[PDB]
Amino acid sequence: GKVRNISGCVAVAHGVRLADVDVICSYPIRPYTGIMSELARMVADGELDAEFVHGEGEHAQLSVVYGASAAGARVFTGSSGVGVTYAMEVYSPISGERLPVQMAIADRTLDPPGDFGEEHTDAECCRDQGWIQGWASTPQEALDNTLIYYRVGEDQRVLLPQYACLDGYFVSHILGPVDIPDEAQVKEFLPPYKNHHVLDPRKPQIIGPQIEPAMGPPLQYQRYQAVKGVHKVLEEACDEFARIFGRKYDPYLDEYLTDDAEVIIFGQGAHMETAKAVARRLRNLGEKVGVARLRTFRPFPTEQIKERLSKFKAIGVLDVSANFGISCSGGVLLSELRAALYDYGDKVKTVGFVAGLGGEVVTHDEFYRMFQKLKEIAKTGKVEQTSYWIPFEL
């Protein structure tokens, strides 16, 4: 398709346009706002026919698309930062009612530190809600994930909402080359939304009746089984996306120079691209370093990680977040990667790096200091403290 140099915001909007979304609900918060601004223009200029609902806030945004998804509309909304936490109540009702709502999150820190830049903290607060979730690291991937998450989420085997996440500023604003698909491609990839229940007076259903505790375990387990089936469907979607669009995504891990790497940095989102640039430079110096970027955060690829990343001497885990009080005092990725690789805990050394707090750039130098810590850990086979908060501690 047409190749354009565009922001992640505008890339997401084209994905939403191509998916022919039926109901959108807007509200402003930096840095995701531009997504809705572009969609508002697209509706005003007739490039997309959708009901464009001015939500009174983020809680309402999610509530509006809850209602619309139950009435059979394909729906889109999004937010950032404290907007993500303000809408928290509604995430579980959406998932538990099996409504494949898509919500874009362009990351913004919570309050405090406030309105400047990104942390993954906001979206990671949602990691229990029963949603598909992953981070785009480029504007192109931002568009592609929009389409892929609609296809996987709305598949009648799944019927689960999705968080299509992208780094604030670093993906949402920074321009990048994006191959925009054409309508014929998307129509072959993305069938129209069809749920197993819908609000329709011709076929009346009662959606969400109160249950007693004894009904709790069956229904929770039912959703669990839906969650556990996502990976298979996502593999199929990634195969079809490669076939139809010509871009081949790994469903779980974007690996770079891991073939004979002895240490890698593991993490997600845009800062991993910076990690790759550092890795290549260190490789030219003869360092056997590599990078594994997590493409799919929920459901977590426990077994795929166990299988594909247990061959390294040391893994440094980047958490661009402030997950306070968590086991091992890094962030969430460190705890979940260790849980995944637990059987290899004696051989595969792991350590967490917390950096990019408050939207700071994770710089080439900081990554250098990360790879150099891993090099040391690999040689001695010992980890001194389970986390380093950069740049205060490393």
Partner 1 sequence: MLDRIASIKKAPDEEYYVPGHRTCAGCGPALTYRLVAKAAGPNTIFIGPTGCMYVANTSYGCGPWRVPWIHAQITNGGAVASGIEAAYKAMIRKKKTDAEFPNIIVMAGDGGAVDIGLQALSAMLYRGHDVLFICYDNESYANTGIQTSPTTPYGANTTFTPPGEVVPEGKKLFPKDNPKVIAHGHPELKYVATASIGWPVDLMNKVRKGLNQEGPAYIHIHAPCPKGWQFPADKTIEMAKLAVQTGMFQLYEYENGEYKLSVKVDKRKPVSEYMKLQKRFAHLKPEHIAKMQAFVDARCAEVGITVPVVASNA
Partner 2 sequence: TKDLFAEPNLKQITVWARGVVMNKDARDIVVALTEAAAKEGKYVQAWENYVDLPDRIYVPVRAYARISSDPIESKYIYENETPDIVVLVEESLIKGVPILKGIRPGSTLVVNTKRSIDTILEFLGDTGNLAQIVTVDANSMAEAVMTLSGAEGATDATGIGAGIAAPIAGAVVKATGIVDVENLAAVVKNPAAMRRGYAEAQVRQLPPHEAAVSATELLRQMPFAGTVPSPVTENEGMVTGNWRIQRPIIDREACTECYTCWIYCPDSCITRTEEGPVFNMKYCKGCGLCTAVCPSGALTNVPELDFKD
Ligand X SMILES: Cc1ncc(C[n+]2c(C(=O)O)sc(CCOP(=O)(O)OP(=O)([O-])O)c2C)c(N)n1
Q: 296 with 163: CB under 8 angstroms?
A: no
Nearer to ligand X, 208 or 345 (CB): 208
Q: Does 254 bind ligand X (CB under 6 A)?
A: no
Q: Which of a second copy, partner 1, ligand X, none interacts with 272 (beta carbon under 5 to 8 A by kind)?
A: none
Integer Cα distance of 24 and 21 in angstroms? 7
Q: How far apart are CA 211 and CA 223, in angstroms?
A: 15
| Of 214, 260, 284, 286, the one binding a second copy by CB under 8 A | 214
The single residue among 2, 46, 202, 212 that binds partner 2, judged by CB under 8 A, is: 212
Pick from partner 1, partner 2, a second copy, none: which does 242 bind, CB < 5 to 8 A by kind?
Answer: none
* Cβ 360 to partner 1 shortest distance, Å: 14
Is residue 121 a contact residue for a second copy (CB under 8 A)? yes
Local structure of 175: helix, strand or coil: coil
319 binds ligand X (CB under 6 A): no
The per-residue DSSP string of 217-267 comes to: HHHHHHHHHHHHTHHHHHHHHHHHHHHHHS----SSEEEES-SS-SEEEEE
CA separation for the pair 62, 325 (Å, rounded)? 29
Using only C-alpha atoms, the chain has a radius of gyration, in whole angstroms, of 21
Name beta bridge partners: 378: none
The one segment of 73-81, 173-181, 248-256, 328-336 that binds partner 2 by CB under 8 A: 173-181
Q: Pick out residues in 289-318 that bind a second copy (CB under 8 A).
A: 298-300, 302
Using alpha carbons, select from 316, 324, 331 the residue that is nearest to residue 370: 316
- Of residues 61, 79, 95, 145, which one binds a second copy by CB under 8 A? 95
40 vs 54: CA distance, rounded Å = 10
Q: Which is nearer to partner 2, 169 or 266 (CB)?
A: 169
Positions in the binding site for partner 2 (CB under 8 A): 5-10, 30-31, 33-34, 37-38, 41, 96-98, 112-113, 116-117, 167, 169-170, 172-176, 196-197, 204-209, 211-215, 217-219, 221-222, 270-271, 273-274, 277-278, 281, 285, 361-362, 364-365, 368, 391-392
